[model samples]
Target chain A: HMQDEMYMARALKLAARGRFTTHPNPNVGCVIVKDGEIVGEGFHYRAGEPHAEVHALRMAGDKAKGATAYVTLEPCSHHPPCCDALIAAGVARVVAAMQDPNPQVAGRGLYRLQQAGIDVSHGLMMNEAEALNKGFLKRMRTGFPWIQLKMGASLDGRTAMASGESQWITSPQARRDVQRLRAQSHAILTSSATVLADDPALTVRWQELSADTQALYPQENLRQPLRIVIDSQNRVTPEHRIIQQQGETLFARTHADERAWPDNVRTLLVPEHNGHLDLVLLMMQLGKQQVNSIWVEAGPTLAGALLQAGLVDELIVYIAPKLLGSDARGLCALPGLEKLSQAPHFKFNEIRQVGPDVCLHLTTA
Target chain B: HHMQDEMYMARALKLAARGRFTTHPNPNVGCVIVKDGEIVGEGFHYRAGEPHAEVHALRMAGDKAKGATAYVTLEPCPPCCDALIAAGVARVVAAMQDPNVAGRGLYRLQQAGIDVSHGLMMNEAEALNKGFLKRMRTGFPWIQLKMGASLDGRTAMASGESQWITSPQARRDVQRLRAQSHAILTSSATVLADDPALTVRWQELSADTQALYPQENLRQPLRIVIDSQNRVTPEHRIIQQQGETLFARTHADERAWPDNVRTLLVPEHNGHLDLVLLMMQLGKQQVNSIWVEAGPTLAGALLQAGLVDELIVYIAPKLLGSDARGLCALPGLEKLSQAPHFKFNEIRQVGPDVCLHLTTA
Candidate 1:
């Protein structure tokens, strides 16, 4: 049992190595062990790629016939070749972290394997497996992407000057760290005001990309994830920097059912409620599109709207150790919140010093 | 070497810290006259309109006042020092040069042929009298502003229910600060809202201050009201409190002056009193260490005038919504550059409240 657990951990570690590329598909790693020794291992690379079991099965060749197969997720019975391939290959047993969250697979794969006269055991190191695929599970369960909001703050929790001259709020290192966050997310949402005010070319440009990262995700597809702008009134034009950039760019709006299909740019038509964009429908559409997570980079007005809607899942605050007085804008715009009791609370997940600034990751308590 | 003097000044500084809140309108001075390493007498100016430290020491020394070396924390003000002079004291050693007399007291002692030494442990002595020195030179007591708010920066709630934002320990800690101030003053609006007695009753240093003296009790500080509209009344609880009172008014001729109160007239300007000019008047009274406790209107006015020396804020770890209550009432601080400058000096946990101290930068 202990050896099987060790193999499961090894498989999970290999699975994490493919995190960037694996989405819309669970990042799973598999290991084939013959007796007390391992013959081969592999991870799910990207959507439409070969399953981890197939890669490891091919690598082990004849040695995998009697070897025990360990995987970080329940092997899929519905996918091509599937766990049947493992049965046909004559593996002695199957070990897994937990039942897959995908309703189609769930525990059906393990039941089929058991019925096929194979020893099937799961729930080994289950929590790690759950954490590894949290975003995927969240999408499957909630029909919405896991939202992470990003904002820069001062010691007193202010955003920028009253004049809105917020050119450089974060340090160089925090900005670079942001690029990595973008690279990992399936999609990023920003307000039209942010593009109009900042003109930020929202693209994943990792100047210091790790060699390991390059191997996991080929350089040819860094901007492969969906880049979306939540502009209500078709304000951004083709002249916008993000518009000119390559990749799947979506302009989500509230007013129209059709965009006349703007130049190579797709549109997400979310319904308007009370003269504002209904954000819940927008997130549901992102979920249908298989976007597991989203990183929101917007100002306090839009950020406040998201918070008011109770849509923000996590808060990533970068505090610059400085003072900006009454003339500065605050981190969020919660207008008309007159009592201290009405102010929202947050529980910190992590707090650390990034360069001269402090990065605090928190969630609604 | 100054080894023996620093040792003595360390003791003097401790004594000065205790008596500081009590002895306003006069420098807090500690005196110890010794003869051949034997303690002859010990004395400190314990109250306003009271005997100077030298008089108390001379009175205690009696016949032994002659041929003794004296240690005093500040240069003598030369009032009733005739008692120490003609009493045949041998020498007077002072830790600092007093700005008012500015070494003339030492010069007088030297001309009287009494051996005089000055500026031993001067910095330590000056630390205990920052407000005193400020008053003597700038003609205004050092101003320190205090306010309380919840975690979301709301000092009160939408319905104006702000009974206990900070923890009980935070209120007790503020009492310690009031213990250090000579007079605690609040604006008319604040007094009309809160109606605090503004008395220093917290006994953080009571037993220690009591043990040092054969006196009855530690002196209670003067309570002051800065009512530009002349709104404070005798029926107000603060006026009825068991202590001395001083009221500063712009125009209050029709109001009956209670025998227990001393009224001060402040300059009027655009419906608001010239607080700086009022401070000059307070300095003229030789009053040092006046603490300003006001609402945002006066807090902003005092703060913008650059009169506040330190700012104390007690923040609770909770939110009261985006209430109309703010720590101070100031407009147009929306710019990062427009915020008034202050440096974080200290942070402490007082029960569930976090007390932050900032000094004007």
Candidate 2:
């Protein structure tokens, strides 16, 4: 078990490389061992590519004849490709982190391997296996995407000016730090009020050095993430900056008026709840759209709505050292904490300075 | 000269840190008198009405001070110059030229044909009495607005339970600030509500506070109040306690003044008492610096006057809620540019809360 734990932990470590690629697909890691010596190892990068087993098995080649296979998840018996290939090859044993939760073969893949005489064993470092796959597991178990709400607010929790003048409170370096967060996220979501007031293009333009003359703007050639806006009444004009940008924009609205459509722009007419577009239905559609991580960069009202509905997963705050005084609007319009005891306790995940501002990551204690 | 200069200035700053909240109308200055290299006399101003640093050191040195060079944190005051000249000191060195005297005393020393050198370790000396310098530059006492709030920005709970929001060490740190300041200023509401005596007490005070002060005896900051209506009673602990208290009122004749309390009848223009004049009057009294630990009304009034010079915020890692007390009550900051801004001088953990040293504008 200890030997399996070590190889499976290595397998899990390799599987983490699949952030961009293996969203709907489970992150799988693999290693092939011949007579207690490692032969080869590889991990799943993205979808439509070979699984970790294919790469490792191919790397091992004829040397894998009397070898054992270690995988972070059970081999896909539904495809009957990787496990069957392992069986056809002369691998002596298969050790896995956990059984896959796809329900097609849950345990049948391991059973098929055992019957196939590959000496199958599973469930080593299962907790580690489950934690790394929390997003996939949460979606499969609950049918909702994992949502992370990020905002840059003061210690007093004012994100914008009272006049709603959005910029200049925080440093430019802090804004660039938000760009790195956008690169990892599958989609960046903003509320309708924020879209109207700021008229932001909400694209992931980053510091990545490109070929030749260096176009800094988000363009058609750049790596594009899906941009979703919560425009219930469709106030955004067709010629808006976000619409004119290189990426596709989706208006998650209640009414799909043809007046709101601007050429190829898409609209998801989700159900409305409490005078607002239903956030539950919105999250469900995002899950169907295969959004693994959702970044919510919005005003306090929308952030408050999400927080009230218990839809926010983690909160990222960029607290500037200076004060914007006490009169500016707070982080969210979350119901007044009635008492000191009613205040929510938070555990610090990380604290670092994004230039002059300090970014604090907190989770519910 | 450089190494000895650093050693003496280090001792000066160390001595100054202990005099907080007491040495009012005077800079918290330190002086060491030396005959050659050996220290003959060492002293610092500990309390209000106490002998200044130079006089204390000169008296301790006695006849040995004749040829000894004097190292002082601040430029010698009038009495200091008179005594040093009378003692026939060979040479006098100082960390900084006093902003109030502004090298006038040094010129007098040079005219007496006594060797005088200054501006060595000047930055440390200025930082040692930033409040005193600010008062000298402006006809207002230096304002250090102190705010202690939960991460939620509330000073007290909904049930009015705010026995101590900060850690015990954090309280002591505030006490030291009070100890260093000329006065601890608050609102009359705070007097009627919390009834604090505004005395300096420490739990985890560093070894310097204990070892440095013998002549620097037990003393308290002058408890001050901005009582616009003069409704507070003599029964308030701040006045009843064993320290001096000053109350600024719009109408001086309205209430019976406490025996121990001195009243400042600040003129009223419209609704509020003239806070700017109140500050100028305090400066006139030689109140070099003030620690504003008051409610939003007084705090906002001081800020609106542009009187606040520094900010000391103790940020506890807990949030109260929207219903909690905010740090200030200023309105009409419609744009971010209109907001009161600050540059951080230093930030460090004081017990559980984070303490910020800020220069305000």
Candidate 3:
């Protein structure tokens, strides 16, 4: 049982290789073991490519027959290809981290393996598997992309000084870490106020990263996320750096503006809800475009709205050690809570130090 | 060439820390009785009025203590020295001389013909009893200012609403500090504003508290409030709540108060109660350490007076904006170099809040 867990853990690590590349498809990994030795291992990189099992079987060659196979997710029958390939390879036994959650496949992939006289076992590291593909599962179940909110503030939770001086809050190392998050995201979202004030490019600066970090996200295999700005009031213009940048930029507005815009910039009208943009509708439209995950870097207005609307799935905070005076800018602008119990609560998922700053990963409780 | 003496003294220091949370007013003393390079007995002082570490170790060694060398964290007390002499200990190695006895115990041991030595890992040993030593020498207890605030250092919102800034876990940490302290100090402004019960909440403390402070033997710290104008009423929670309470005022007003409330008159300085005089009074009462949870004005006064030894700030991951109440109300310095500074000694996440441990730079 321990050896099975070890192999499944390795498969999970292998699956993470496709974290940034697998946009619509679930990232999966497979391992071929013969006589207690790993003969081959592979992971699914992108859509329309060979499945993890097919790659692993191909790598194992003749040794794949009668060998044990470990897959992060059950061999998909939706392909009728992965399961069929494993059966043809004569895998004596198959172990899976979890069953495919896709409606088309469900448990049929594992069932097909059992029908083929292969010893099939599932639910190995199911929670890890589920988390790795959380966005994909959410999109398949609900037509909304998973949204993560990111913020950088002082230890006292101030985003900027009273004079609006926010040149830097967190350390350079922390800002570099944010680029990793940007690279992992399928879309980068910001609000009109942020663009008006900062005019941030919001691009994943791959060139700024070190060679070791860049190796993990190969240039040829990576895809640039579409930058989306919430300009419900139509304040943003093509002169903004985000619009001037060479990448797809989507403007979410309450009304379609006929003003001429750059060819790279596209505008979409979303309904207004509760005096703000309907973030739910915007997520659905993005999901239709196969945007499974969105990284939100917005001001207090949009950030608080998303939090109050319960659309934020995760909150990643970079906390600096320095203190800005009480007159400084707060992290969010939610209505004052009369009771302590009524304040928004989040459970700490992880805490770590990046240089002098601390990074906190939290989820709504 | 006793190469093992340093190693044994290091062990004694570790043993002393086991009583760090339990011992107050008294120094945390650890003793190791060794015979023929082998440890025969080891003990540490756990609480005030408990048997000294030397007595415990000597009793455990019994007849084998004769001709044995004892490694002690601090110089033995008079009774501890007498007991070791009667036990026929041949040699005694102490890490540091106790300031209370001023080497009297060590001198007595030498006069008794026992080979006595001092200054072995003296710095490490002195640190273990820093508060006790400071109080005995300076006529002032070690003061620690504790505050919980937003990441922007705001103690409350613009409306003065600070119901819960830090998480429940950080609040429990404050309770631990109170339980470990000899006195819990607040101010008249805090009492008039929040009317907080400065008593330690034993129920809020977690399991490790049992090991540090056995409930059956736990002694709650004295709750002291500085009321320069006698503004505090008997109805205040600090006065009516559990544990002994002391009111330090410039002068006791002619007002009837609860019998449990004691009043101490101290001189006034700059229209406020003399903090230095009050600290000396606490030191006379054997207060080795004090945990101050006062308002911004009092906190600023303590910092400005240079009375604070350590500052513990619990910073919550939220912002109350610049319009909110700040952590302290220190006067603005005309020159930047005149500003009080602190060195960050430690930093760690406490629940959703970050705790910073700093000492005056």
TM-score of chain A of each: 0.93, 0.84, 0.93
Q: Chain A of candidate 2 scores what in TM-score?
A: 0.84
DockQ of 1: 0.15
lDDT (tens digit, per residue) of candidate 2 on A1-365: 67776767788878876654465566888999887788979898667789899989889999989698989988888664788888777888989878876555578878888886778887788888886666676676667766777867664556665666667677787777777667556678988788877888888774442322133223343455678999888877786787778767888978876774555578899988878799888999888876667778887678767876778777787777555556666666546656556554454566676767767676655
In model 2, the fraction of reference contacts reproduced equals 0.40
Off by over 4 Å in 3: A47-49, A87-92, A112-117, A207-212, A219-222, B1-23, B36-43, B46-51, B59-62, B75-86, B90-130, B133-141, B148-173, B201-218, B240-286, B296-361
Q: For candidate 2 chain A, which ten residues in a row score worst on lDDT? A: A209-218
Candidate 1 lDDT, A92-152, residue by residue in tens: 8999888978676588999999998989999998899887767787888777888989878
| Error of model 1, residue B289, in angstroms | 11
The order by descending lDDT is 3, 1, 2
Which one wins on lDDT?
3
Q: Top DockQ: which candidate number?
A: 2
List model 3 lDDT by residue over B1-361, tens digit each: 4678989998889888878777777789999989987899799998888888998788889999998999999989848888888999889999988776678998999998999999999889877876788898888899998979864467877677897889898988888877878888888888899878888777888778655666676677888888888888777788787668888988877998877788888887788678888888889888899999988788878877889998788977564544567766556533323434565567777788778777775
What TM-score against the true fold does each predicted structure earn?
0.62, 0.73, 0.82
The models' CA-based lDDT, in order, is: 0.75, 0.75, 0.81
